[PDB]
Amino acid sequence: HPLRVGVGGPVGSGKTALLEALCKAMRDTWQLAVVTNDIYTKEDQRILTEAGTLAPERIVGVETGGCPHTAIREDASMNLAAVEALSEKFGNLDLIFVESGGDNLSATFSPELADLTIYVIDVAEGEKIPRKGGPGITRSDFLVINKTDLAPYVGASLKVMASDTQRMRGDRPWTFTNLKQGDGLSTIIAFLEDKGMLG
Amino acid sequence: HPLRVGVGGPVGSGKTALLEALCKAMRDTWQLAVVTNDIYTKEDQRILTEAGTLAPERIVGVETGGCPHTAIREDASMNLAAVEALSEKFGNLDLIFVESGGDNLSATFSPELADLTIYVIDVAEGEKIPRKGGPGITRSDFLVINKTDLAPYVGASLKVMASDTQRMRGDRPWTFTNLKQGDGLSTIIAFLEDKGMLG
Ligand SMILES: Nc1nc2c(ncn2[C@@H]2O[C@H](COP(=O)(O)OP(=O)(O)NP(=O)(O)O)[C@@H](O)[C@H]2O)c(=O)[nH]1
Ligand SMILES: Nc1nc2c(ncn2[C@@H]2O[C@H](COP(=O)(O)OP(=O)(O)NP(=O)(O)O)[C@@H](O)[C@H]2O)c(=O)[nH]1
Ligand code: NI
Ligand code: NI
Ligand code: NI
User: Residue B171: helix, strand or coil by DSSP?
Assistant: First the structure.
């Protein structure tokens, strides 16, 4: 049975960009599928399918209504059914990603739905976002701080963000990324293959 | 009694920057106060106070816990009491802003708490955010699309975003802003003075 990786974070932080890059880099080694969530549309399913990240039948969209965290935590029924339909259809899957709808800082995945959690924030949301806290920043299995290339335009210091993040997470891993260039991707891939116990 | 203006939007879109700019521009004509919200911190209260947007006692922070939308919609009692205390303390306020915690695209203010709503998204969240919809984009009294200066770095077309916004909102007013520079504020001020019936 496949590892379920939940990818969460605020609106626009780079979750879909992360899935696209991970799928393109890992799909020749591992059998993958993706469940995307959005409240009102299936836009991210279309984006990932049109980008060719995986074959279309490996990418499923769920339109949740309401809060994204409800669909990944309080009532995960739809996402669990979609994961079941994929696992039964493909049989040999190693890893299924679930992209949350973008949400507020209190949102996390239920352990019933996600075996590992990646939380994605981005620098343009502000230097102080790590200090504003929440379980995505403090307790996710892996935190991604994306869009470092935008730091000079919003006036954020990456040294400050790194210090604040370390104060919030202790020994729990995190990395800066620039998903436009792919910077920081290989380390996330290594974390998934290891802590996800792939193979 | 003062006009209550709710300012909502996803994490990091520029709500506090908008409040800073509106306060600095409007405070010489109108008597203002601000209630800031966040889930785990009072950081935005500190940020506005340190920026000198208003005197310290005109800016009150509420730490909500849970989802930001609960505090501005389903159970707004804490915010309602903070708005009432500011109104009684200052006696003659024309307008009180309430900044939501950054949230998902389904978040709105109850009419009990907000007379007018401003919803703030930003270009770095993606060209496609207007199309992802929701009542903040489609039904808010005024929509702000902030951080236009970041469009070339994220690869977003403002022409496309404007076309999609017109389809989502019809004639309901909106504007692009660059709050780093102050562009676009005059439209928002004129809307508040007119539809807010100030004076
Ligand atoms: N400059 C820059 N832009 C980035 C980076 N990562 C993503 N972007 C841009 O950021 C925007 C949002 O990316 P996207 O992957 O759609 O984020 P999301 O978190 O999936 N959005 P949603 O919450 O709607 O699902 C896009 O315009 C994308 O090009 C980065 O590292 N640097
Ligand atoms: N380049 C640029 N940066 C902007 C603009 N508006 C805001 N910023 C930057 O964007 C980041 C977030 O702004 P902020 O006002 O804190 O947003 P917010 O929506 O109030 N955040 P929160 O959801 O945490 O309350 C800050 O680093 C701020 O400097 C803009 O138009 N252009
Ligand atoms: Ni996405
Ligand atoms: Ni703010
Ligand atoms: Ni919620």
Answer: coil
Q: Which segments of chain A does DSSP mark as H helices, in order? A: 15-26, 43-50, 68-69, 77-90, 129-132, 135-139, 151-154, 158-169, 185-195
Closest CA to A172 of A144, A194, A198, A131: A144
- The pair of structure tokens assigned to A6 is 């939940």
B40 and A105: CB-CB below 8 Å?
Answer: yes
From chain A residues 83-112, the ones with a CB under 8 A of any chain B CB are 101-107
Sequence spans of domains, chain A: 1-199
Query: Residue A180: exposed, middle, or buried by beta-carbon count in 10 A (0-12, 13-18, 19+)?
Result: middle
| PDB resolution in Å | 1.8
Q: Tell me the C-alpha distance between A169 and A162, whole Å.
A: 10
B161 closest CA partner among B182, B179, B145 = B145
N-terminal to C-terminal alpha carbon distance within chain A: 11
Q: Is A74 on the interface with B (CB under 8 A)?
A: no
C-alpha A7/C-alpha A72 separation (Å) is 10
Residues 6+ apart with CB under 8 A from B152: none
Chain B residues whose CB is inside 8 A of the A132 CB are 38-41, 43
CB atoms within 10 A of CB A185: 20
Tell me how many residue pairs between chain A and chain B have CB atoms under 8 A apart: 111
Q: What angle do CA A78, A14, A71 make, to 5 degrees?
A: 15
CB B144 within 8 Å of CB B123: no
What is the CATH code for A1-199? 3.40.50.300
CA-closest candidate to residue A39, choices A59, A64, A75? A64
Q: Where are the beta strands (DSSP E) in B24-173?
A: 32-38, 59-63, 95-99, 116-122, 142-146
Q: Please name the helix (run of DSSP H) or strand (run of DSSP E) that holds residue A122, with its range, or none.
A: strand A116-122
Q: How many CB atoms lie within 10 A of CB A7?
A: 29
| Dihedral sign computed on CA atoms, order B74, B78, B81, B87 | negative
Residue B124 is nearest to which of A106, A124, A133, comparing CB atoms? A124
